């Protein structure tokens, strides 16, 4: 059992967008609710909505979502989240989660309570912005050329002005990992993201190459850096 969200994208303010969560290793039944939970960059988890896995149509929404988002089961292994009138405040990673519950009482008179989440997807990233997609510029990071050289040195790549997230950075096609430090991205005033990655290298042991990928614009940049 795993979950996988898809459909995240860069869209403009006012746009709609539909996300999909697909289940593997189990199908939806009356033993679970399927739910969506989001998290804006650097912020907390926000519950959005839950839908009953059984035959009855039972959906619950956060008070801020009902009227603007809709959750549906489109098959025994897929639920969607339709979002309308998006704003920059809806920018977030969106998780699909499975929810366990206790049936309490007796009926038709029985109700669900003791909700908790026992399974999560890796999440899908939604970006709501005025700006259009933009591939990053990659610049070398090295010590001032005026300074006296040195055996041991740290070098890097500045990955600047991309949208949307994410980019990924490896060094020497992944064969260099020790001494690598890649910083979380920052959103600059421009609305564009930037990050840096640096690697500390023993001496003239290697030429080091940073490998930068920006999947949203189908872009990969190799930059060989030297001092």
């Amino acid at each position: 059992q795993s979950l996988e969200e898809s459909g995240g994208d860069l869209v403009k303010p006012g746009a709609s967008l539909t996300l999909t969560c697909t289940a593997s290793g189990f199908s939806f039944t009356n033993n679970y609710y399927m739910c969506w939970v989001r998290q804006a960059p650097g912020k907390g988890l926000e519950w959005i909505a839950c839908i009953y896995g059984g035959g009855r149509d039972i959906v619950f929404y956060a008070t801020w979502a009902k009227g603007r988002f809709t959750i549906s089961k489109t098959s025994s292994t897929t639920v969607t989240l339709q979002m309308t009138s998006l704003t920059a405040a809806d920018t977030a990673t969106y998780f699909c989660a499975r929810e366990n519950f206790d049936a309490v009482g007796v009926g038709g008179g029985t109700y669900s309570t003791d909700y908790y989440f026992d399974l999560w997807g890796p999440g899908t990233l939604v970006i709501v912005s005025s700006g259009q997609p933009k591939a990053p510029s990659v610049f070398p990071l090295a010590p001032c050329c005026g300074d006296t050289p040195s055996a041991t040195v740290t070098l890097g790549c500045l990955v600047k002005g991309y949208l949307p997230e994410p980019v990924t950075v490896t060094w020497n096609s992944g064969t260099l990992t020790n001494g690598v430090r890649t910083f979380p991205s920052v959103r600059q005033s421009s609305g564009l993201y930037s990050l840096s990655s640096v690697v500390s290298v023993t001496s003239s042991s290697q030429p080091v190459t940073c490998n930068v990928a920006h999947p949203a614009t189908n872009t990969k940049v190799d930059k060989t850096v030297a001092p």
Binding site: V37, G44, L45, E46, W47, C50, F60, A62, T63, W64, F95, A97, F101, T113, D114, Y115, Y116, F117, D118, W120, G121, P122, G123, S137, F139, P140, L141, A142, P143, C144, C145, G146, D147, T154, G156, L158, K160, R181, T182, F183, P184, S185, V186, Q188, S194, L195, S196, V198, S200
Partner: protein
């Protein structure tokens, strides 16, 4: 509607120590309270449900307790590997609520003090023609926290600065920090000395370069 409040927003503890986190509900939730751990880039993971029941697989170092409207998560034998954000979640009702989660609590683990190694990186030669110039300063491998100050020709910079800190190292509790100064090309060429100052308690390391020499 049922609102969940976690305090404090952040908490610290020495390795081997024990830290406690609180969760208040605005009305009884009949002990339907779960705790999750979340590290950067990952979905939350379940630690505890029903206030005090350990999820299958999780370390007994995690203890949930409480009842009515007051709940607690306790972590014992605190390891650097426990540095993360912790969330409570009321499971009483999903009918007419804003958010079932509390706001979260960051756990900072105090390992051994380490002074930062500080480096400054002048802009590559091709940046300035883009109309924008970006200068990078890094403070690598340090604990506890540092503060960064930039100066341009001896004047404290107060705008154009963006800091980014990595999560605590799971082995030695340390941070890495980058600090970036961004200026227009006109601003950049109108000054000479660029300075990054990283201060840790009473020690500061200052790295500079002069536009001309790079």
């Amino acid at each position: 509607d049922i609102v969940m409040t976690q305090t404090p927003a952040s908490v610290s503890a020495a390795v081997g120590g024990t830290v406690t986190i609180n969760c208040q509900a605005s009305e009884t939730i009949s002990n339907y309270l779960a705790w999750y751990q979340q590290k950067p880039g990952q979905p939350p993971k379940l630690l505890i449900y029903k206030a005090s029941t350990l999820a299958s697989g999780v370390s007994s170092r995690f203890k949930g307790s409480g009842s009515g409207t007051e709940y607690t998560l306790t972590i014992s034998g605190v390891q650097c590997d426990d540095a993360a954000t912790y969330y409570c979640q009321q499971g009483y009702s999903i009918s007419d609520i804003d958010n079932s989660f509390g706001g979260g609590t960051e756990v900072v683990v105090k390992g051994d003090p380490v002074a930062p190694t500080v480096l400054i990186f002048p802009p590559a030669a091709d940046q300035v023609a883009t109309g924008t110039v970006t200068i990078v300063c890094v403070a690598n491998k340090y604990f506890p926290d540092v503060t960064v100050t930039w100066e341009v020709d001896g004047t404290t910079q107060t705008t154009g600065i963006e800091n980014s800190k990595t999560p605590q190292n799971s082995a030695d509790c340390t941070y890495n920090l980058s600090s970036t100064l961004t200026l227009t090309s006109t601003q950049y060429n109108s000054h000479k000395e660029y300075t990054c100052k990283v201060t840790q308690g009473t020690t500061s390391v200052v790295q500079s370069f002069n536009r001309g020499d790079c």
